[PDB]
Amino acid sequence: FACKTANGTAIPIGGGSANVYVNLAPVVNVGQNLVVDLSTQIFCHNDYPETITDYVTLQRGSAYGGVLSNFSGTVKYSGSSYPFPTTSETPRVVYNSRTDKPWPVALYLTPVSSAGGVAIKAGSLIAVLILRQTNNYNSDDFQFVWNIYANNDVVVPT
Numbered sequence: 272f273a274c275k276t277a278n279g280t281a282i283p284i285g286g287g288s289a290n291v292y293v294n295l296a297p298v299v300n301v302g303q304n305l306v307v308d309l310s311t312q313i314f315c316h317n318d319y320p321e322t323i324t325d326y327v328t329l330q331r332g333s334a335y336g337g338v339l340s341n342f343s344g345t346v347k348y349s350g351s352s353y354p355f356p357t358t359s360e361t362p363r364v365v366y367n368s369r370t371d372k373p374w375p376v377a378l379y380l381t382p383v384s385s386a387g388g389v390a391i392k393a394g395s396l397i398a399v400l401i402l403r404q405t406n407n408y409n410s411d412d413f414q415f416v417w418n419i420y421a422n423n424d425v426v427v428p429t
């Protein structure tokens with residue numbers, strides 16, 4: 272089991288960490304959503320699906336910088352929505368193919384009522400999402416840590 276981003280940055284067997292750089296809607300008004308869809312950015316596969324079933328959860332999702340201060344949100348994982356920052360580990364998604372498939376996570380953020388101006392700065396860390404992988408074969412229990420970075424500023428009109 273291993274993962275890679277849309278630009279080919281990989282995290283190999285055993286876990287580790289990688290940066291994910293995201294383009295963000297440049298203008299978001301109070302009452303509107305900023306959607307950060309990681310299903311187009313993070314992909315994983317099972318290396319031995321003939322014998323092993325891999326189990327993948329969103330173990331934890333934390334907010335940083337402008338997302339922590341200026342937005343409220345939820346995280347959608349494999350069809351269900353949860354609070355973001357997260358309060359617990361999600362149920363598991365099965366990875367049973369050697370063909371890469373997306374990690375089905377997206378953040379649904381909305382500016383807080385008093386947000387205004389440059390609500391997210393270009394180059395800043397916005398979130399850390401931990402993918403936890405286990406299996407039905409041995410004791411492997413690994414973390415694939417995804418550091419989500421903004422490619423651009425996001426302005427909330429005042």
Ligand SMILES: CCCCCCCO[C@H]1O[C@H](CO)[C@@H](O)[C@H](O)[C@@H]1O
Nearest residue numbers: 272284285317318319323325406411
């Ligand atoms: C004849 C025994 C072969 C043994 C192969 C194990 C390969 O293990 C890797 O691939 C497995 C399948 O993705 C993962 O469950 C495991 O954590 C690790 O990433």
Ligand code: NA
Nearest residue numbers: 273282283284
């Ligand atoms: Na690998």
Ligand code: NA
Nearest residue numbers: 272284285286
């Ligand atoms: Na692995």
Ligand code: NA
Nearest residue numbers: 408409410411
């Ligand atoms: Na093991």
